[PDB]
Ligand binder design. Sequence first.
Ligand SMILES: O=C(NC1CCCCC1)N[C@H]1[C@H](O)[C@@H](N2CCCCC2)[C@@H]2OC[C@H]1O2
Length: 330
Amino acid sequence: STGSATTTPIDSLDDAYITPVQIGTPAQTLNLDFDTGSSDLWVFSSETTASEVDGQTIYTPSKSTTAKLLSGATWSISYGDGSSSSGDVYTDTVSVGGLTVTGQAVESAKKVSSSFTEDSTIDGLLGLAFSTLNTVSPTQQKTFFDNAKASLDSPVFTADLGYHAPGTYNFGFIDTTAYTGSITYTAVSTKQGFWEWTSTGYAVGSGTFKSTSIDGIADTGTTLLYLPATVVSAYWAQVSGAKSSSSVGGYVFPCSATLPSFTFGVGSARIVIPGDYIDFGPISTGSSSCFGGIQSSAGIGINIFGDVALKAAFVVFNGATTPTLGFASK
Ligand SMILES: O=C(NC1CCCCC1)N[C@H]1[C@H](O)[C@@H](N2CCCCC2)[C@@H]2OC[C@H]1O2
């Protein structure tokens, strides 16, 4: 089997991407944020505190004939941005782009933090990191991918995120028309539960490539690219007037600037992030200070190849017995 679903930016900045997901019978379609940096499939629901729901589409398990309470199971998750959610768990049929999993753990939110409530466009998350990070207790649950794996033509999924445009998630096959050149594969460590890999270095604009190992995670659920303070300083030093602002919470730059590209290494290969991909617009409406798409990971504990990096590539998440990650230009 295979599946293929279009993923769509939630706003003009590509802050995140939503992908329609069918849950239950008859199908209830929710727009979920596919996140290769977490491992819970959770949704706004009929059980979510009413004051915490504002415009989201909810899953109502009582209206699904295939829904079954996973008795005693609860979940609770916090994300790096400080947001959180928690609740109880049903199993139900979940389909993505024509690919169906029966008995998928669907984590129903009883509570969500304010950031989720405030974002009407995201109805939940669909985790695609390793199931060892799944928060369901007392019986940890498998991701959608993990459940689908054995049925797939090939035990892979691909992320092809668009710049200011829709893209695609495929399950079970590699679309050889979706990228240019070849796919370079690189080792993954699953020890932290992430698609963790080591970039071979970087360049800023037309500058010389610096060979240096940068360990980090491929994380579709993170908007920006978070890298060591040395690397980020070298990048923003090439933009006149750019500076790190503690009041704003990162590097900002004059909206009148032309940003240089940023290149990262995947083995001997190179992925080039165009300058424009690094512009996240005015810090507040009408401001001439713009927020940078490359930020320091210093206060995080891990480097994060988020959407800014990933959207520049066609990315293969290879879930074979020894997982690996593939990157191609496109
Ligand atoms: O918290 C992170 N990542 C951390 C960011 C800081 C540095 C460490 C990693 N990812 C989350 C993301 O911000 C959320 N958000 C939704 C609305 C706008 C788009 C993003 C979304 O919900 C959970 C997940 O995706």
